[PDB]
Design an enzyme around this catalytic site. Structure first.
Site, PDB file in Angstrom:
ATOM      1  N   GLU A   1       1.103  -1.119  -0.347  1.00 32.45           N
ATOM      2  CA  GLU A   1      -0.455  -0.168   0.102  1.00 32.45           C
ATOM      3  C   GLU A   1       0.674   0.694   0.137  1.00 32.45           C
ATOM      4  OE1 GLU A   1      -4.260  -1.476   1.773  1.00 32.45           O
ATOM      5  OE2 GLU A   1      -2.837   0.687   2.703  1.00 32.45           O
TER       6      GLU A   1
ATOM      7  N   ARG B   1      -1.061 -11.130   2.233  1.00 35.15           N
ATOM      8  CA  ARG B   1      -2.328 -12.516   1.660  1.00 35.15           C
ATOM      9  C   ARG B   1      -2.500 -11.962   0.171  1.00 35.15           C
ATOM     10  NH1 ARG B   1      -7.017  -8.183   3.151  1.00 35.15           N
ATOM     11  NH2 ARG B   1      -6.065  -7.878   5.026  1.00 35.15           N
TER      12      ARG B   1
END
Lengths: 271, 66, 86, 91
Positions: free
Chosen positions: A30, A46
């Protein structure tokens, strides 16, 4: 909306991190963008709920790849079949919309209840990852009340937009009152289509909380018939339904009548 | 080299993984809580097992040992 | 019985002003008077439900209620005695 | 991008001269999932099948990076399919 060489740097930034720490399997990196500067926020180690969207533009099954990687299979082998980094690109544009019980008529509070009806979609590149919404199954307040994920895919952003719109309008969830009407406005938004929107896009656009009274007339007549069948009708003696005498109706064409000239026409001429 | 795979999850992601696994000829196992006895995901797998009937569906998907 | 829905009511004698008869097949929705009461002319003494429709039965005069043949939620037939007054 | 495969699920009996079977469907299930596209025709749990038109229950198309992947996706979907009350060309 972003510049071409900007996303390269953001991708490179991600690759530089994950290659430096020997990352295995699927992970998201991110960021936070302003002007022309990447800023590392977090790593999600994940798959994310919104993986499909990227699988649709790149052409890779991310989830499939996870299992094979775990199986020890090589990234560029006969199993995973991943293209070389210089060969991976994006075909068209994809969008994902979230559909949850959360009331837009009541400060996004997840709703406990049992669904009375569910109605799917379909069409060119329209993913319908259905979780909580299928039959007449009650949902628990304990779980993230994800009713449906809704994903579309097309070469044009405008074409992926109208694909999402039609799917959103074809949806039917009753019992609970969903975030649908809200989402349609976001898809018919010039500043969403344009590309440049902030993480403040929603708050500073108050007309996205504008709801339309979309009636479900079918549901309403099923409810009427049901009520009268079971409970009867005022002043009507509970007995066997008519159409006892099937006396079919005499009829005359519109054409013929359109030609008729009588006292109506007379009024129109003489007064 | 995987023969059978369990999803430590429910909902559409579990279905998705089962399908991916089936595409690789991998046997699948679903876990379900006491309230997910009717969750579609329970049925879209080769094996179904209940996660703690004495451990409420609130806690079920998070209990590492069971 | 378990409620009073099996109960057979006597027929109101039509040529006696004391006897009030059921005008339609209905259901007793609300009993409003008991044995030994006195209210004015037009007193709403019984509430029936014909067929999803509701009418109050009124006294034709002043007097004392001698008998009430029905209870709440009781079925009635045309000509069934409901009330007797003096 | 990748490879795509299509076939049509019909009521043709693969044991009996691929002759279109008729009658009512009493159970219908279908697949789906990433890279799988289902264009339904006469295949649904409701109505019966008339012999008057070309047979087609579901148009089934799949899409993956490799061709082999696209095939294994197609196979699974065919196996995932459940149709009762009429013979199909699925096997």
């Amino acid at each position: 909306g972003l510049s071409p060489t900007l996303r390269q740097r953001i991708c490179d930034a991600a690759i530089q991190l994950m290659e430096n720490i020997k990352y295995v399997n699927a992970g998201t990196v991110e960021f936070l963008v302003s002007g022309d500067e990447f800023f590392f926020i977090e790593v999600n180690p994940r798959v994310q709920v919104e993986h499909t969207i990227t699988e649709m533009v790149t052409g890779i099954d991310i989830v499939k790849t996870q299992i094979l990687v775990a199986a020890g299979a090589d990234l560029f082998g006969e199993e995973i079949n991943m293209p070389q980094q210089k060969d991976i690109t994006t075909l068209g544009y994809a969008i994902q919309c979230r559909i949850t019980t959360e009331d837009p008529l009541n400060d996004f509070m997840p709703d406990t209840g049992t669904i009375i009806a569910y109605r799917s979609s379909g069409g060119f590149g329209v993913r319908l990852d259905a979780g909580d919404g299928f039959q007449g199954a009650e949902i628990s307040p304990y779980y993230d009340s994800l009713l449906v994920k809704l994903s579309t895919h097309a070469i044009s952003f405008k074409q992926a937009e109208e694909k999402m719109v039609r799917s959103l309008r074809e949806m039917r969830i009753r019992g609970v009152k969903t975030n649908i009407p809200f989402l349609i406005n976001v898809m018919k938004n010039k500043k969403f289509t344009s590309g440049d929107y902030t993480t403040k896009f929603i708050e500073e656009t108050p007309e996205l909380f504008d709801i339309q009274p979309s009636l479900d007339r079918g549901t309403k007549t099923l409810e009427y018939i049901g009520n009268v069948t079971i409970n009867g009708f005022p002043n009507v003696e509970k007995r066997p339904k008519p159409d006892y005498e099937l006396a079919s109706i005499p009829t005359v064409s519109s054409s013929k009548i359109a030609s008729f000239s009588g006292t109506k026409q007379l009024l129109d001429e003489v007064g | 080299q995987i023969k059978k795979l369990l999803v430590a999850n429910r909902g559409e992601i579990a279905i998705r993984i089962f399908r991916a696994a089936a595409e690789l000829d991998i046997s699948t196992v679903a876990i379900y809580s006491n309230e997910d006895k009717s969750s579609l995901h329970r049925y879209k797998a080769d094996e179904s097992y209940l996660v703690g009937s004495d451990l409420g569906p609130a806690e079920s998907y998070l209990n590492i040992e069971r | 019985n378990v409620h009073t829905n099996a109960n057979v009511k006597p027929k109101a004698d039509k040529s006696n002003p004391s006897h009030i008869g059921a005008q339609m097949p209905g259901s007793v929705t609300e009993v409003k008077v008991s044995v030994g009461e006195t209210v004015k002319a037009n007193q709403p003494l019984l509430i029936t439900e014909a067929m999803k429709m509701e009418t109050t039965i009124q006294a034709p005069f002043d007097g004392v209620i001698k008998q009430v043949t029905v209870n709440n939620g009781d079925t009635i037939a045309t000509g069934d005695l409901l009330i007797e007054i003096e």
